[PDB]
Write an enzyme that holds these catalytic residues in place. Sequence first.
Site, short mmCIF file in Angstrom:
data_model
loop_
_atom_site.label_atom_id
_atom_site.label_comp_id
_atom_site.label_asym_id
_atom_site.label_seq_id
_atom_site.Cartn_x
_atom_site.Cartn_y
_atom_site.Cartn_z
N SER B 143 -50.50 30.24 -30.42
CA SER B 143 -50.68 29.68 -29.03
C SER B 143 -52.36 29.42 -28.80
O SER B 143 -53.03 30.14 -29.68
CB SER B 143 -50.25 30.75 -28.17
OG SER B 143 -50.55 30.49 -26.66
N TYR B 156 -49.83 39.48 -25.14
CA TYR B 156 -49.56 38.37 -25.77
C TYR B 156 -50.64 37.69 -26.49
O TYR B 156 -50.54 37.34 -27.92
CB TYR B 156 -49.17 37.40 -24.76
CG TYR B 156 -48.45 35.94 -25.03
CD1 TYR B 156 -49.56 34.88 -24.95
CD2 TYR B 156 -47.22 35.92 -25.44
CE1 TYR B 156 -48.93 33.76 -25.45
CE2 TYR B 156 -46.74 34.44 -25.75
CZ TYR B 156 -47.55 33.54 -25.58
OH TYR B 156 -47.14 32.18 -26.04
N1 LIG Z 1 -44.04 27.43 -23.76
C1 LIG Z 1 -45.41 27.66 -24.04
O1 LIG Z 1 -46.03 27.04 -23.11
C2 LIG Z 1 -45.90 27.78 -25.20
C3 LIG Z 1 -45.27 28.80 -26.11
N2 LIG Z 1 -45.49 29.04 -27.13
C4 LIG Z 1 -44.93 30.01 -28.29
O2 LIG Z 1 -43.63 29.18 -28.72
C5 LIG Z 1 -42.55 29.99 -29.06
C6 LIG Z 1 -41.48 29.79 -28.03
O3 LIG Z 1 -41.96 29.84 -26.84
P1 LIG Z 1 -40.61 28.93 -25.54
O4 LIG Z 1 -39.90 28.15 -26.34
O5 LIG Z 1 -41.84 28.43 -24.88
O6 LIG Z 1 -40.04 30.36 -25.37
P2 LIG Z 1 -38.58 30.37 -24.57
O7 LIG Z 1 -38.66 31.43 -23.93
O8 LIG Z 1 -38.32 28.92 -24.06
O9 LIG Z 1 -37.37 30.35 -25.70
C7 LIG Z 1 -37.55 31.37 -26.52
C8 LIG Z 1 -36.69 31.63 -27.59
O10 LIG Z 1 -37.06 32.72 -28.49
C9 LIG Z 1 -35.66 33.24 -28.76
N3 LIG Z 1 -35.75 34.77 -28.90
C10 LIG Z 1 -36.48 35.51 -28.05
N4 LIG Z 1 -36.33 36.96 -28.32
C11 LIG Z 1 -35.66 36.80 -29.77
C12 LIG Z 1 -35.44 37.84 -30.65
N5 LIG Z 1 -35.57 39.15 -30.52
N6 LIG Z 1 -34.71 37.65 -31.73
C13 LIG Z 1 -34.43 36.27 -31.96
N7 LIG Z 1 -34.68 35.06 -30.99
C14 LIG Z 1 -35.43 35.38 -29.89
C15 LIG Z 1 -34.58 32.83 -27.67
O11 LIG Z 1 -33.25 32.75 -28.06
P3 LIG Z 1 -32.23 33.62 -27.35
O12 LIG Z 1 -32.64 33.67 -25.99
O13 LIG Z 1 -31.16 32.19 -27.70
O14 LIG Z 1 -31.76 34.87 -28.22
C16 LIG Z 1 -35.33 31.38 -27.48
O15 LIG Z 1 -34.58 30.76 -28.50
C17 LIG Z 1 -43.05 31.58 -28.71
O16 LIG Z 1 -43.62 32.17 -29.97
C18 LIG Z 1 -44.08 31.17 -27.60
O17 LIG Z 1 -45.04 32.31 -27.54
C19 LIG Z 1 -46.88 29.04 -27.56
C20 LIG Z 1 -47.70 28.06 -26.87
C21 LIG Z 1 -47.38 27.62 -25.63
#
Ligand SMILES: NC(=O)C1=CN([C@@H]2O[C@H](COP(=O)(O)OP(=O)(O)OC[C@H]3O[C@@H](n4cnc5c(N)ncnc54)[C@H](OP(=O)(O)O)[C@@H]3O)[C@@H](O)[C@H]2O)C=CC1
Lengths: 262, 262, 261, 262
Positions: B143, B156
């Site tokens: 990030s 974070y």
């Molecule tokens: N959105 C933003 O503005 C930004 C996001 N990011 C990074 O991008 C990545 C995705 O973020 P985003 O898509 O926004 O977050 P979301 O909350 O939209 O999606 C999160 C994802 O992580 C999965 N997940 C959560 N906990 C677990 C776990 N314990 N084991 C496996 N899968 C897990 C969920 O799957 P399920 O719920 O299906 O289990 C879901 O697919 C993160 O690392 C975040 O830090 C970085 C910079 C900016």
Amino acid sequence: KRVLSGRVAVVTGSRKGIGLGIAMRLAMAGADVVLNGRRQSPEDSAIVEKVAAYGTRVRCFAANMKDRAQVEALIKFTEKELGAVEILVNNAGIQHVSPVETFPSDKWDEIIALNLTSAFHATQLCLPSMRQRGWGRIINIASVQGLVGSMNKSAYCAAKHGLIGFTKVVALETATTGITCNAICPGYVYTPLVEEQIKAVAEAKYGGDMEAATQAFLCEKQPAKAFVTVEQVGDAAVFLASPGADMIRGTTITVDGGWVAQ
Amino acid sequence: KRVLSGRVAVVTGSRKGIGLGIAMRLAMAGADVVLNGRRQSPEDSAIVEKVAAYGTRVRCFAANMKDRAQVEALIKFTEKELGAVEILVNNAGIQHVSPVETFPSDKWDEIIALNLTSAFHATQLCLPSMRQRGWGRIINIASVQGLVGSMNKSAYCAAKHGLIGFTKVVALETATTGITCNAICPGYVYTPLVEEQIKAVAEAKYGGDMEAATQAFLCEKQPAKAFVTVEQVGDAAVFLASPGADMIRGTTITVDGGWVAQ
Amino acid sequence: RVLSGRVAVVTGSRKGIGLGIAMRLAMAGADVVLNGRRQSPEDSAIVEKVAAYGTRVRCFAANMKDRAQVEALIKFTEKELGAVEILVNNAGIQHVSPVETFPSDKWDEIIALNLTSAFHATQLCLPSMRQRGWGRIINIASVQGLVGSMNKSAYCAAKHGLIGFTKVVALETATTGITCNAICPGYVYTPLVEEQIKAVAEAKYGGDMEAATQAFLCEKQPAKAFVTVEQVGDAAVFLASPGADMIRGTTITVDGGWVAQ
Amino acid sequence: KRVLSGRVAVVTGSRKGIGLGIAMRLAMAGADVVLNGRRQSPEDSAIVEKVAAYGTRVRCFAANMKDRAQVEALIKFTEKELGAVEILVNNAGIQHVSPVETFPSDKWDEIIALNLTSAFHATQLCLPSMRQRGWGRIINIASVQGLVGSMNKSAYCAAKHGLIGFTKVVALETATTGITCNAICPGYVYTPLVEEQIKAVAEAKYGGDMEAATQAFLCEKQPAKAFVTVEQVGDAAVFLASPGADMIRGTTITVDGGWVAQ
Ligand SMILES: NC(=O)C1=CN([C@@H]2O[C@H](COP(=O)(O)OP(=O)(O)OC[C@H]3O[C@@H](n4cnc5c(N)ncnc54)[C@H](OP(=O)(O)O)[C@@H]3O)[C@@H](O)[C@H]2O)C=CC1
Ligand SMILES: NC(=O)C1=CN([C@@H]2O[C@H](COP(=O)(O)OP(=O)(O)OC[C@H]3O[C@@H](n4cnc5c(N)ncnc54)[C@H](OP(=O)(O)O)[C@@H]3O)[C@@H](O)[C@H]2O)C=CC1
Ligand SMILES: NC(=O)C1=CN([C@@H]2O[C@H](COP(=O)(O)OP(=O)(O)OC[C@H]3O[C@@H](n4cnc5c(N)ncnc54)[C@H](OP(=O)(O)O)[C@@H]3O)[C@@H](O)[C@H]2O)C=CC1
Ligand SMILES: NC(=O)C1=CN([C@@H]2O[C@H](COP(=O)(O)OP(=O)(O)OC[C@H]3O[C@@H](n4cnc5c(N)ncnc54)[C@H](OP(=O)(O)O)[C@@H]3O)[C@@H](O)[C@H]2O)C=CC1
């Protein structure tokens, strides 16, 4: 009076190495100081008296910083014996050298716990009093390894990078107050933490020759071809604790003989 | 036919949000892809079919990345179904917004565990095969918060800074091989992780007006005054996985509308 | 072909990294104007090599240290192919010397070419890009723009400056379809580097280029391999593509791990 | 008696603003100081008295730092009057605010000439004596603008970034000697350079309301919502000049109220 006269400082992991250098320099600058390590040692009296040689109040409290209850006890002990914690130096830290593939899971966890999460616990416990009083210093001892990577130090580089990120956030959350949070990033300092690595290099690659191993170790990374000293790291802590640093917030003071400049 | 044709990729946390975007763009570039989330969903077949529209092999495997045994199960499943894991995307991540003083201890630990330590576990499990095969891509979704701090995001920012530090070390330990390790640093992307934050801002400061809250939320940090898209993050992953990135090692690809430039 | 129809100018592009970039842009579908200081008998062959990918290719001689010649290059492109949509500021020079004896003229020349000429070209191209709502400015910086190296004071200064300039241009265009970014290569085996290896070989290794090349490379570059001109070109194509509409003011470092340690 | 006692310092552009704060702080710390500006001023004697209040030797020499011959004259004057130049502070600098498209060519050149090239000229002229004596300090006054960009400041950000790059190289070329070279990166300080900018935005955008203009100017960039002071920049220069900084080499000391931390 001296520049930190009347200030109460806690330095974690401070009976030896960089932590003791920081504790000495803070006391020389007028601060009361609480020393700390995991377990009481026979040397505690002598080390307390060394630091107390400069006319301030010095204490020593055994507490394992990986245990949040013991971090809290350290803080409460300081509040009871000396007063509110005004300067917190998060210094206690460990190292384990291993390629990533074979890095022991528990050693990774231990390095994260001590080198990053314990600083969060201590900072969380100390901030309310600093905010109430309108003044504070949180000084995190990071590393050059918090700004760049080195082979076979994945957990440590991760934790130290994380500690620098944490420093930034704490500084931003306190930016309009008299509390600052900053990190010091030393390069190589000749402490047991580095001596053990040089011994491994000497045995593995130099037939046991510590002098040859030390030069190679040092010169791989540190353009000055000399070690940083614990006193120099202490001087940086005094600078960050002084009034001239009231507006130094969320930054790194890198004391590394040129390592990060190249 | 396509640049990643036949490559086997695992994207953690990839049934929604950025991870799904990455899986889509990798498949679009020819990769076979394994999707992943914590627990099986009724939508799994529909999501697999959506990614499978790019004409590659797609699978889905439930595994909580905070549990090292389940990380191993995900890798073993991929090896049995499709072959060795060649592209590992560490994407699964969580957020919790709180000032440092009241940041819950178990939420801090959970963020470190998933956003940093899970990437170490998966990387450790995948590297031996990649070394044997002479090729690999480890792509860590960090990030902007891994390069700068933001208020109320201490855990974070610490985890994401740590993930970038980890990235550097892995890259250095593999620098003379066909394995690279790099990080992508998105700015704000309109996913549920961000929508929930905007909802809190709207309730607290804009009387529920999501349009005002969104503009304030964006323009505080992101000079482009627009969101990054999940497809753009995926396109950065495709770039890192491609032959033109054979000598991109240990670096960050920042896709942030100018956030870190100022 | 993701850059079909786009008109690109690559400065200093008849050899080395610039040629690698021009080739990759043309492969991706862009029309391309090559450039160097003075007309060359090889110009026709170099144009034909880049034209092998089926786009419109031209060559225009212009010394980028002369603002009037920078303007002539942009005007030539506008009349021959059309508005400049992708500007790649690549032309650059090196001079190795300790600070104490660094020639004043060489310092000034490195600043003039490696930093100020990129400002001049950018200033001349931005109005058209704003008018049309699209643009790419790609500055070829270096790892030496992010860290220092001994005996390269002027070059590290200029390259650091070019990265600073990149950020400002990106911030001033952040709400538009124009992006500005920098590519930071590590060592690439061009004449700029070969000349340095020759000097090292003569000084320390009795003329042995294989020994000197390894010592030179391994001092700085953990991969113990050179970055290639094709790789730098691939980074330029990535930055020029739609996937990079929101990459703004940043560095794409292609360096075999140099800045990671 | 004091930490810099007996050291001879030259501060360029030091009769007002940050340069004067640095000269004052260096003299307070025991250094002899040479002041400098473009042309002789009727105020020179009063400025000398201000700096001489700390009981050290003080001189003033008019020299335009954009003219290498006048830079050399300043150094030779110092060598004649006080002795070898031991601390060189490259501080003189200018600003011009303009979008890139209309940035005047001459202004760009002037900013590069003073804010970057003049420091190279002065460093080149001072290094031989420093090497012969085995000690030196080169302190370059950069800016946060040498680490990040800001709109309408293209020449200045380029020059300040360049100054930081130059700092690294000089430090590396001197790393095994008693000479260090470092940069200080202030955030906003309320000098004439900033006041003129705030006055201009006050008239152009805030109806002449200097309070509103100052609030907006500061709070756009500086999380502390307060200015850094010239005394604080001086304190950072004293720190870098002191023995505790013997192994601080090629780095930035950022004094910015949190600007670069976010
Ligand atoms: N959105 C933003 O503005 C930004 C996001 N990011 C990074 O991008 C990545 C995705 O973020 P985003 O898509 O926004 O977050 P979301 O909350 O939209 O999606 C999160 C994802 O992580 C999965 N997940 C959560 N906990 C677990 C776990 N314990 N084991 C496996 N899968 C897990 C969920 O799957 P399920 O719920 O299906 O289990 C879901 O697919 C993160 O690392 C975040 O830090 C970085 C910079 C900016
Ligand atoms: N040496 C170097 O080159 C560099 C060191 N650093 C950092 O400086 C800090 C100190 O390192 P250094 O002095 O070199 O290391 P040493 O190993 O020499 O000293 C380590 C110190 O930490 C204490 N400690 C260890 N574990 C705990 C714990 N769980 N709870 C409380 N105290 C503990 C020890 O106390 P006891 O053993 O008495 O319990 C001792 O005082 C570390 O954070 C290290 O990362 C940074 C850059 C370079
Ligand atoms: N090689 C490396 O390891 C690295 C190089 N770079 C950068 O990549 C860019 C290209 O470097 P490289 O290809 O290695 O250098 P080369 O010396 O191989 O090519 C230099 C190019 O610049 C052109 N050129 C030189 N001066 C001028 C001028 N005044 N006006 C117009 N064109 C000019 C030359 O054209 P002609 O001689 O035909 O007039 C030639 O095409 C430079 O900016 C350099 O700093 C960055 C990182 C690493
Ligand atoms: N104020 C701020 O917020 C910040 C300032 N800086 C830097 O700090 C340094 C000082 O800035 P500040 O004090 O703010 O600026 P001021 O404009 O307040 O003072 C400028 C000083 O530079 C001198 N000067 C200007 N041109 C020349 C020249 N050609 N030769 C010699 N001396 C010259 C002037 O002397 P005279 O007019 O008497 O000739 C004057 O003493 C500059 O490098 C600036 O970039 C960095 C970060 C923030």
